[PDB]
């Protein structure tokens, strides 16, 4: 290891307790840390903290993904809606990648634990919804693509507020592979706009796309996108215009949005502009 000093970012890893695994991904993996003095005019003060290190029995293509996703993160900057790089441990030791800690989990499971027999009222639901699409707002303009925008890639803190990560996916040959079924048995094919699909064509409307995929999870609290379509059936249903319905408990505010979102053509989907405004507007009359 000969990974350069950036004293900007580094942190000491001796001001780091590592604790309780928050999950295993293709190339890395999240642990819960307490961290001592993030902030320096508080060196003793005590912070929760994750951090991602390589997994258990790592090659070097692994630490180039985690040093690569390291450097992209560093430009990322800060906003309310993203995940909030930290600090890196680069030095004398394994290479750590420090954020803020979401006590809540990911958005999938915070929805599912609490589906009513009720936790979640509509309006939680729509600042949800608003939250994530003021995160993406910022992510566009920064000229950043998301690739994988669900429901299981955002985050939620212990006062409810949405982080966009990006945890997922794993490698093919030479391109990420979406059609692998994840440990949590996703299929990610599911969120992916026409155009990235059929094309292999990533822009900031086929995020939109993939935001109306997550407004389906948030309004069906956790729902696993198209019920029962086999990946195979899905993309004859696509080409075909064929959407889902709206779902048994969703106003048709929020379902019509959706919609707008999964308009064939990337350029008749509203922007995540208006997507903040049309969000702000239903959460204000709510
Ligand atoms: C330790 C850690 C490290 C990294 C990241 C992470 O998400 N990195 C990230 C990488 C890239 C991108 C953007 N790209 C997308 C691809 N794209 C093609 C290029 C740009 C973004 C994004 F947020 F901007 F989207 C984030 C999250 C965590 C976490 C955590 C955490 C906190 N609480 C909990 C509780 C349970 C589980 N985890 N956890």
Known sequence: ????????????????????????????????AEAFGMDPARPDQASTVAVKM??????????????????????????????????????EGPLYVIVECAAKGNLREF??????????????????????????????????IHRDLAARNVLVTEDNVMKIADFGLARGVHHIDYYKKTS???????????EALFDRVYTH???????????????????????????????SLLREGHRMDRPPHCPPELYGLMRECWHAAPSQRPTFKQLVEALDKVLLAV
């Open 184 to 194: 949590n048995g996703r299929l990610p094919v599911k969120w992916m706009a026409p």
């Open 111 to 144: 929805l599912r634990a609490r589906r009513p027999p009720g936790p979640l009222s509509f309006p939680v639901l729509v600042s949800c919804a608003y939250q994530v699409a003021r995160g993406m707002q910022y992510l566009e303009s920064r000229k950043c």
């Open 54 to 91: 390589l997994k258990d029995n790592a090659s070097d293509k692994d630490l180039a993904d985690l040093v690569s996703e390291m450097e992209v993160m560093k430009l990322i900057g800060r906003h309310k809606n993203i995940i909030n790089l930290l600090g890196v441990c680069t030095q």
């Open 205 to 235: 409307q086929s995020d939109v796309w993939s935001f109306g995929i997550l407004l389906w999870e948030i309004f069906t609290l956790g729902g696993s996108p198209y019920p029962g379509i086999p990946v195979e059936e899905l993309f």
């Open 1 to 32: 290891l000969d990974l350069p000093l950036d004293p900007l970012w580094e942190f000491p890893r001796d001001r780091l307790v590592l604790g309780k695994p928050l999950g295993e991904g293709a190339f890395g993996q999240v642990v819960r």
